[PDB]
Ligand binder design. Structure first.
Ligand SMILES: Nc1ncnc2c1ncn2[C@@H]1O[C@H](COP(=O)(O)OP(=O)(O)O)[C@@H](O)[C@H]1O
Ligand SMILES: Nc1ncnc2c1ncn2[C@@H]1O[C@H](COP(=O)(O)OP(=O)(O)O)[C@@H](O)[C@H]1O
Ligand SMILES: Nc1ncnc2c1ncn2[C@@H]1O[C@H](COP(=O)(O)OP(=O)(O)O)[C@@H](O)[C@H]1O
Ligand SMILES: Nc1ncnc2c1ncn2[C@@H]1O[C@H](COP(=O)(O)OP(=O)(O)O)[C@@H](O)[C@H]1O
Ligand SMILES: Nc1ncnc2c1ncn2[C@@H]1O[C@H](COP(=O)(O)OP(=O)(O)O)[C@@H](O)[C@H]1O
Ligand SMILES: Nc1ncnc2c1ncn2[C@@H]1O[C@H](COP(=O)(O)OP(=O)(O)O)[C@@H](O)[C@H]1O
Lengths: 258, 247, 299, 344, 378, 308
C-alpha cells in the first residue's frame, strides 16, 4: 500500500490510541492514558513511537506535515469506541496503575490494559509506600487527634474510615455521608490530606471521572464520593495513601456500598 | 472521467450514506446507523468500504486528502432527505435489528433496510436469548413476587403486561400508565429491570421508546436479564400487541 | 477564454440561484427553493446542472475543487437581491406550487417563477385532489356535526369556513380569530384536520416566520403571514361530542346543542392523513368563495 | 511591475472602493455604495469594474484567486479613511441620488461624489415622479381626508407637512414628534404611505426605546414607534449611545399614540424638544358609522375603504407621496432645517 | 541570506513598526502612529515604505503573499515592548504632532519620536492656526457670550479656561469637573466646540459609568475611554423622583486613577490608561450615595449663566433668577459648528490658554463651595 | 534525516522552551520567561536562538514557513508538563531575577533555572540598587512621615513592614489584610509606591470579589461575604501568591494596620502636590525596592507567616 498508511496501521496494531464515547481520542505516551479535546495529542504519539518502527518507517515521521497525514489516517480508523474505567478497584498514577486487591504497583504496558483516562497527576515513588518512616507515626497521631479511638467514637471512626477509603473506587456511589462539625475541628486538614493522597481525583462539568468532590447519586459519568504548613509541601502523601489502601482492603473487598 | 467520482458513485450505490431532515448525514459502519456533527464519519465509511471496491479503486482510498475529495463528492450528491425510524415493530440492537412479530433476529445487510437510528446500546448474543436458563427461573420468580396471579391481580396483570410490552414499538403511544402504590412494591425494581432489558431506548426523549395530552403527540416513541426479560417482553408482545398497538 | 467563468455565467443564465435581502443564497434543486445559511447549497446545484451543459463543460464539474471556483464566480456575480414570496395567492408543495385562485397545480420550471422558499413539507399527491372520494363525504359529515348548516349557525359556519380558508394566503392577516367553546366540541379536531391539510406551515416570534397558519403587535406585516388562532375554553362551538359513557352525558346542559357519538378511531385516522387531501380540496373550494377579489378578516 | 498591482492601482484610481471610520470597506456597484461585513464585497467590484480596464487587464480577473490578490493589494493601499454622508439634502435610491433643493435625479458618476452608504432599497423611476397622474389625485384626496386644509386646522397641517418632509435629510433632528390621535384615523395609513415612499430609510421599533433597538437605527431617516424622561434627552443628539458604542442620529422620531402622553419628569428642558399634531378625521365602518358622529373627540367622519391598505402595500402610492414630500421639503427646509417645538 | 529578511531588517531599522505593552502592533503610515486590532495594519506599512528601499528591494513588495512573509518576519523580530504616549504635552493630529510648550508644528521623523498612537482625527492646516481671522473674532464673541469677562464671573471664567485647557495634555487628571447649568445655556455648545477642536480624543458615554458596579460583565463604555483626553457623560436626570439611582460615590475615585479597570465585549484586557479629563454635563445638583472628605477632593464645578432663547421665550426667560444674562439664540450656529468652522480658532485659543496656565506643571483644583450638602459638610 | 528536526532538538536541548501544566508554552527570550496564549511565541525564540546554531543551521531560520516547521516539531517534542514558580523567594525583573535570600541579582542562564513567568514589568538598573543615593533619604523621610518610628506605633510599624515586605514571594499567605484609614492618609500613596516597586506583580480589582480572578494568577500582591474571605486565603482559588491588602476562623484570617498621621489623628502634616508626579514616574522605584529587600532579609529569612 502506502508508507504513511502502513505506519498508521502498525501504530494502531499496538493499541496505543483509542476512541471513547465522549468523542475523545485517548493517547498512550509517557506511561499514562492522556487526552485533550482541544488539539491533537496523537501527533505526539506518532513522534514517540518513532523508536518502535523499522528504519524505513522511522525517518518518514520527522516532518510535521507527515505527522498530520498519519494522524488523520489513525483518526479515520477508530470506527468503534472502547469502554473506559471498566475496573473500579484501580488507582491511576502518572507512571502506572495500582491494584487495591493486593497493593502492588504496575508500570508500562502492564498499566495499559487497564484503561484509566484520568490519573492522580503525580508519579508513584517506590521508596515511599513503606510501612514505617518518619512520617507514619505523626500521621497516625494526628488522625487519632482529629478522630479519637474510643468506644463511643468507635462506630464514628469505622464510618469515617469507610468513607475515606471509598475515595478510590471507579464506580459510582449512591449514598451520602455528612461532614457536620463545629468551627475548627480539622475538616480542612482532612480535605488537604485526602487531596495530597489522590490529587487530580478531587475537586458539574469539571467533576468528570473524579472520585471525590438525589441528583448526585445517579450513574451519569461520575464516580465521586459526595461528602497545616507541612501538608502543602506534600509530606503525608504516601503514608495517608497507605492508610487509605489499608482501610479499603479492610472494608471494601466484596461489594462497594455506603 | 474521474476516478474519485466513480468511487463516490459506487459508494452511494450501496445506500450506506443517507441524509436526515436535520441536514445531517447518517452512515452505516459495523452494523449501526451512526451519525455525528463534530467529526463526520463519511470519511470513516470511505476508509471502511475499500474492501468492497475493485483493486484499482481500493488503492486510491488509502489517503487522507484523497478521502476528503470522495467525501465532498458524496456529500454534494445527497440532494434530498430521507426519513428515519419508520418501522415501529423492530428492536435495534448494536449488531442488527430483531423483529417482534416474527421473532427472527436479523444482522448485517438484512438489518440495513430498517433505518433505526437509535440503538438498544448493547450487542445481542444469540446464545443467551433462550427459554431455559438459570436466570430466567429466578426472574419469573421475582416477577411473581412483585405481582402475583391472584384475584385482585388478574386484570391488573393484563394491564401490566400490556404496558410493559408497549415499550418496544416505534409508534406513538395513545395512553399514559401510572404506578400508584406503596414503597417496596416493585416500582423501582421493574424500572431497573426494564432499563436492563431495553437498554439505551430508555430515559428516566428523541426516539426514546420509554420514559419514566402533550406527551401523546407525534419526534417521540416513549410510553410515559437482557435475554430473559427480553424473552418475556417479546412473548407478551406476541400475546397482546399482535394486530394493532393501542393503550 | 475561462471555462470556469463561462460555466458560472451559464448557470446564472438559468436563473437557478438567487440572492436574498437576508443574505442567503436560495437554490433551485428538486423543484424546491431550498436555502441553508450554514453550508452553501450552490455546489450541489453546480453538480446537478451538470447534465445540461456541453460535454466539454460537464467533465470539469466532477472535481470538488473546480466547483468552489464556480461557486466563487457565481457569488461574485450576484449583486441584485431578489425578493422572496411576493405572490400571496399560492400554496407551495414539495413538487411545485398550487394556484388557489384558478385551481391547477404547477410543477417543475413552472413553479420556479413563484419564489416560494417555505413549503408544506409533504408531497402533493395528484390523484388525491378529487371532489369525490371515500373520505371527503365522511370529512364533510365531520364539519356538519361540528358546524351544522342551521339558520342560527349559518353565520358561525361562514366565519369558520372563512377562517379555515384564510390559512392559505401569503399575505399578512389583520384579525385574531377565536375558537371559543366548551370541552369536546371539535376544535382540536379542526386543528388536526388543518395540520394534516397544510402541514409544515403550521406552528403550535422568530420561529413563527413565513408560516401561513399558527395556533395589535401580531397584526402587522413586520415577515408575518400567519393566521393567528387562539383556542379558549370569534367562531363559537356548540355541538359537544360525547362518548358512550357520555351518552348519558347528552341531555341536560345548554352549553351544547347537539351531541354526536364519539368516534375514538377518528383521531387515529387523522395522523394517518386519511382526510388530508379531502381537506385540501375543501379549503381551496372554500377559499375561492370569500377571498377571490381580496383577502381580509373582519374583527 | 506586478500586473495585479497595476490592476489594483487602476481600480483605486477610479475611486470605486472607499474606506470609512468604522472598519467597513464600502464598494460602489450598481450605482450604489454598498457595504457588508460578512463578505469582501470588494471582490465583487473587481469583477464588475472589469469592463473598464484594457483588454490585457481583463481576462485575468476571471479567476477567483486573482481577485483575492487584487483585493489584498487594494486593502493594503487604502491607508486613509473618508468621511461619509456629509450631504444631508440628498435622498439615495438604489439607482441614483435625488437632490432635494432642486429635485433632480442624478445617476452614474454624478451620483457618486455624494457618498450614500444607506439607500431607500428600490429604484427611482423617472416617468412616475410627476404631478399629473390618477394616483396623484387619489393620494391628494387621501391626504385631504386625513388632514384637511381648513382654518382651524392650519398650524397643525403645517406641522404635519414639516414633520413628514423632514424625513428626507441626513441632518440630526433635535425634536420629538407625536401623531397623537384616536384609533383608526390614519396614523398607520401615514406610516404605510411613508414606508412605501422612502423605503429602507424607515424603521419601526418597540416601546423599550421610550421606556439593541438603538443600534439598528443607524443612518435611518425615519423611526416610527407605534402603540422615561431622559430617553428624549438622549434621542435628539447627533451621537446617540448604543451598542449592538456611538451611532449617528440622522433620524426623525415619530411616535404613534392614542391617548395624551404622560412623562416621568416634566421640566422646561423637555418642552423644547416636543411636538404634537392632532388627528381629527375618523374613518369608521358603515355599520358603525352612526356611532362616530355623536362622539366629540373627533371632528369629521368618512367611509373606511378596504382595498386602500392592499394597494398601499403594493407600493402603488409610492412616487406620488415622494413628490409630495419633495414639494413640502422645498418649502420649509431650503435655507436651513430646524424642527420647532410646540409646548402647547 | 534572504532577500525578504533583509527587507524586514531594513524596515525595522527605520523604527516604523513598534510593539506596545497592550500587545498591539502600531505602524507609521502617513505621519500617524495608527493601530488596528482586527487586521495586521503592518502589511500596509510594508507597501508604503516601498519607496524608502533600493530598486531591488521595492519590486518584491508588489506581491501580497510576499508581504505576508515580511509581516511575519517583522512580527518575529519585535521581541521588546514599548510604552507609548509617554510625552503628555503633545497634541497628535492626522498629519503631525503639535507641541504645546511653544506651539511649533512637526512632521515626519520630527513627530515620530513621540509615539502617540491616538490622534485628533483631522489634518492640521498651517494658515488657520493664527490670531487674526473673522472666525477667530466671532469665536471670541461667542465664547465671551458663554462666559462673560466680568469680575463676578472672573473666577468661574478662569477655572473654565483651565478645565478646557487641560483637555490637551496626556497626563492623568485626578479632579472630576462638572458642567452644572440650566437648560439652553451652552454646555452642549462647549461640548460640540471641544468635539470639533480635539475630535477623536473625545468620547460620549451614558450615566451607567456613574451609577453601576463597573466591573460585572462586559462593559465597553470603559474600554473605549482609553487614552482619550476628554470624556463627556451627558444625560444626568434629576434624582428627586422614584427609580433614580444615586451617583455611586466610589466611581469618582475609580475614574481618577492613572489606570481604569473594565472589560470590553469578550476580552481580557481589563487595564486602560486613563488620560481623560472626566467632565460631567449635568443640569441639577448631583447627589451621591455618601458624602465625605475623600470624595470632596475630586470634584470641581463651573456654573453656566448666560441663557439662550428666541424672542418668543425671551420675556419668560428674562425674569428667571436661575440665569444672569440672556442673548439672542442663533439657529445656524449649530450648523456652522458641526461643519468644523470654529475648529482651528478654538484650538489656537486652547493652546494659548494652556501656555498661559499649565506651562510649569499640570494640576487641577476642586471647588466644593457650590453644592448644598457639600456646603453643609463644610 | 531532517535539518529542521535537528534544529528543534538543539533548541530544546538548551531548555529555552518549556511546557507548563496549564497547557501553555513558556519561552526564554531576552532573559525573561514570556508566555502568551494568543499566538505561538516559540517562533520568536527560533529567531532569537539563530545566533547559537551552526552556520548551516542558521540560514534555515530566515524563513517564516521554516520557522513554523521547527515550531511544529518543538510543539510535538514537549510531552512532559513542568511546574512553574516553584521558588517563592525570588523577584523576577524583565532582565533577570533577584535572589531575596542574600540580595544579589542574577541574569541570563543564571536566572533561567528559576522558572518564574510573571516579571515585575521593568528592568533592573545595576547602578541604582544602592543604600545611599540622592533619591533615597527622602524615601525613608516620606515613609517615616506616613508611619513615624514611634514606640507607641512600633508594633504598627513592624506589622506594616512585615506585610509590605511579604509582597515579594511566591508562597501562599493565609490571612487577609486591610489598609483601613481616613482620607488623605497615604494609603493610595503606599499603593502607588508598591506598584512602582513591583509593577506587574500588582493588580487592582473592585469589590465584586469581596474573570476578575483569572488575571490575579501568580501575582504577589493585589488590592481592592465572609465566604469569599474563607476562599481567598487558600493555595488555590489558578495559583494564589497574592498578599491580599485592601467567628474564630474569621478571627485567624484578618490583619489590619491602622494609619494614624493625617496630611493636608495624632499628627497633621503638609501635602506634597508634586509627590504623586514624582511617584508615578518611578523615581523611588529602586530605592523602595532596596528598602523592601532589606526588610525581607531582616524579617522573613527563616520562614514566612503573617500572624493576625
Ligand atoms: N493533631 C493536630 N495537630 C496540630 N494541629 C491540629 C491538629 N488537629 C487540628 N489541628 C488544627 O486545627 C485546625 C482545623 O481548622 P479548620 O478545620 O481548617 O477550620 P475551618 O475549616 O473552619 O477553617 C487546623 O488549622 C490545624 O492546624
Ligand atoms: N421479587 C422482589 N420482590 C420484592 N422486592 C424485591 C424483589 N427483588 C428485589 N427486591 C428488592 O426490594 C426492593 C423493592 O423496592 P421497590 O418496590 O422498587 O420500591 P423502592 O425501590 O422505592 O423501595 C428493591 O430495592 C429490591 O432490591
Ligand atoms: N363527527 C365526528 N367525527 C369523528 N370524531 C368526532 C366527531 N365529533 C367528535 N369527535 C371526537 O370528539 C373529540 C372532541 O374533542 P375536542 O372538541 O377536540 O376537545 P377540545 O375542544 O377540548 O380540544 C375529538 O377527539 C373527536 O375525535
Ligand atoms: N382617505 C381615506 N378614504 C377612505 N379610507 C381610508 C382613508 N384613509 C384611511 N382609510 C382606511 O381607514 C383605515 C384607517 O386605519 P388607521 O387610521 O391606520 O388605524 P390606526 O390609526 O388605529 O392604526 C385604513 O385601513 C384605510 O384603509
Ligand atoms: N452665543 C451663543 N453661544 C452658544 N450657543 C448659543 C448662542 N446663542 C444661542 N445659542 C444656542 O444654544 C444652543 C445650545 O444649548 P443647549 O444645547 O440647549 O445646552 P444644554 O443642552 O446644555 O441645555 C444651540 O442650539 C445654539 O443655537
Ligand atoms: N507624608 C506626606 N507628605 C506629603 N504629602 C503626603 C504625605 N502623605 C500623603 N500625602 C499626600 O496625600 C495624597 C494621598 O492621599 P491618599 O492617602 O491617597 O487619600 P485617599 O486614600 O483618601 O485617596 C498624595 O497626593 C500626597 O501628596
Amino acid at each position: 500500500g502506502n508508507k504513511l498508511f502502513n505506519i498508521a496501521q502498525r501504530i494502531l496494531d499496538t493499541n496505543s490510541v483509542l476512541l471513547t464515547e465522549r468523542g475523545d481520542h485517548i493517547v498512550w505516551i509517557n506511561n499514562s492514558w492522556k487526552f485533550n479535546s482541544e488539539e491533537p495529542l496523537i501527533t505526539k504519539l506518532i513522534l514517540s513511537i518513532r523508536h518502535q518502527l523499522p528504519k524505513e518507517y522511522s525517518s518518514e515521521l520527522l516532518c510535521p506535515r507527515k505527522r498530520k497525514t498519519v494522524e488523520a489516517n489513525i483518526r479515520d480508523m477508530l470506527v468503534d469506541s472502547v469502554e473506559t474505567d471498566t475496573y473500579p478497584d484501580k488507582l491511576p498514577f502518572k507512571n502506572g496503575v495500582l491494584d487495591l486487591v493486593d497493593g502492588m504497583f504496575y508500570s508500562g504496558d502492564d498499566a495499559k490494559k487497564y484503561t484509566c483516562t484520568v490519573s492522580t497527576g503525580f508519579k508513584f515513588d517506590d521508596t515511599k509506600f513503606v510501612e514505617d518512616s518518619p512520617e507514619m507515626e505523626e500521621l497516625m497521631n494526628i488522625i487519632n487527634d482529629i478522630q479519637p479511638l474510643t468506644d463511643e467514637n468507635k462506630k464514628n471512626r469505622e464510618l469515617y474510615e469507610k468513607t475515606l477509603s471509598s475515595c478510590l473506587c471507579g464506580a459510582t456511589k449512591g449514598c451520602l455521608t455528612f461532614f457536620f462539625g463545629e468551627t475548627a475541628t480539622g475538616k480542612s486538614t482532612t480535605k488537604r490530606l485526602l487531596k495530597s493522597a489522590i490529587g487530580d481525583l478531587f475537586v458539574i462539568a469539571n467533576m468528570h471521572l473524579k472520585r471525590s468532590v438525589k441528583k448526585l447519586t445517579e450513574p451519569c459519568r461520575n464516580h465521586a464520593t459526595i461528602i497545616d504548613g507541612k501538608i502543602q509541601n506534600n509530606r503525608y502523601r504516601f503514608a495517608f495513601l497507605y492508610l487509605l489502601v489499608k482501610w479499603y482492603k479492610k472494608y471494601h473487598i466484596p461489594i462497594m456500598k455506603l
